[PDB]
Amino acid sequence: AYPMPNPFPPFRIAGNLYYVGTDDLASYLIVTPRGNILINSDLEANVPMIKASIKKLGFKFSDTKILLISHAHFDHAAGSELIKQQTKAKYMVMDEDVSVILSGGKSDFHYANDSSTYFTQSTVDKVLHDGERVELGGTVLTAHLTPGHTRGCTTWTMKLKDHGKQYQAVIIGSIGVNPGAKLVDNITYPKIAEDYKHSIKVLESMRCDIFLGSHAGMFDLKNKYVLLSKGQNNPFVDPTGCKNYIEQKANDFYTELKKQETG
């Protein structure tokens, strides 16, 4: 059973990007004059928490115009149908992950036969592609296809202005290798290893100032939030941590590949 995340205080990360997630599953709110964009619906049990966080910041849940996700796995997309019903937000997903979203996880190349990983089925209002942009009220998000973890895992990026300076925010979708995933001669997802390697190439050459991810633990949410409360110069601007994390996971992939190929 996936550990139920604990509530986390919502806050502004930089520019018009706010954190409205939990102490684990990370969710983001981009506020614009023409509505807001929400990233990651998390677990069903988390929807009320996400709505509450958005309202705590002084915004309206009803102003959610677009719903996005890091990748198609229950812990990041299970609550999407509820959010669509409750806000009428337009659901946009990377083409490669659409099948999983429509089938509620039944078509998952790895978890197709694990009902504990299934989630409510939902329709995709707009199919996204590598490098496509999502724009609203002047804000521009770019969807980067960084496959492997899921066929259509998306790494979202955007430029934020903070304290007069410009910073590239990167929400790493995930390039982690889940326990059991087969990297060699995968029957259902043959290009899995090839995809991970492509993601490593993309991520390792990607400008990254404001380091974020689908999971709080990826970018040290807790400690950075504490520094933020202490009033430190945006502790979320962490290009060094981003570089190191990407390299670490890139190496974690090769460690698993090595294990599967020679262990």
- Output the smallest distance, CB 27 to Zn ion, in A: 12
| Binding-site annotation: residue ranges | 71, 73, 75-76, 149, 215
Q: What distance in Å separates the CA atoms of residue 149 and residue 199, rounded to the nearest whole number?
A: 10
Query: CA angle 22-23-28, nearest 5°?
Result: 40
Phi-psi region of 104 (alpha: psi -120 to 50; beta: other; left: phi over 0): left
User: Cβ-closest residue to Zn ion?
Assistant: 73
Size of the site for Zn ion (CB under 5 A): 2
- Output the smallest distance, CB 38 to Zn ion, in A: 17
| Binding-site annotation: residue ranges for Zn(2+) | 71, 73, 75-76, 149, 215
Query: Per the structure block, which two tokens stand in for 58?
Result: 């002084």
Q: Which helix (H) or strand (E) holds 249?
A: helix 239-262
- Residue 16 or residue 146: which is nearer to Zn ion going by CB? 146
- Beta strands at 126-128 and 133-136: parallel, antiparallel or unpaired: unpaired
- Residue 162 or residue 195: which is nearer to Zn ion going by CB? 195
Q: How many other β-carbons are positioned within 10 Å of the β-carbon of residue 64?
A: 23
Bridge partner residues of 19 (DSSP):
11, 28
- Output the smallest distance, CB 137 to Zn ion, in A: 29
- Output the smallest distance, CB 145 to Zn ion, in A: 15
Q: What distance in Å separates the CA atoms of residue 60 and residue 129, rounded to the nearest whole number?
A: 29
- Could you say which residues in the range 46-75 bind Zn ion, by CB under 5 A? 73, 75
Is residue 97 at the binding interface for Zn ion, with CB under 5 A as the rule? no
- Could you say which residues in the range 123-162 bind Zn ion, by CB under 5 A? none
- Residue 51 or residue 73: which is nearer to Zn ion going by CB? 73
Nearest to 252 by CA among 154, 111, 149: 149
- Output the smallest distance, CB 99 to Zn ion, in A: 16
Query: Per the structure block, which two tokens stand in for 166?
Result: 């410009």
| Binding site residues, Zn ion, CB under 5 A | 73, 75
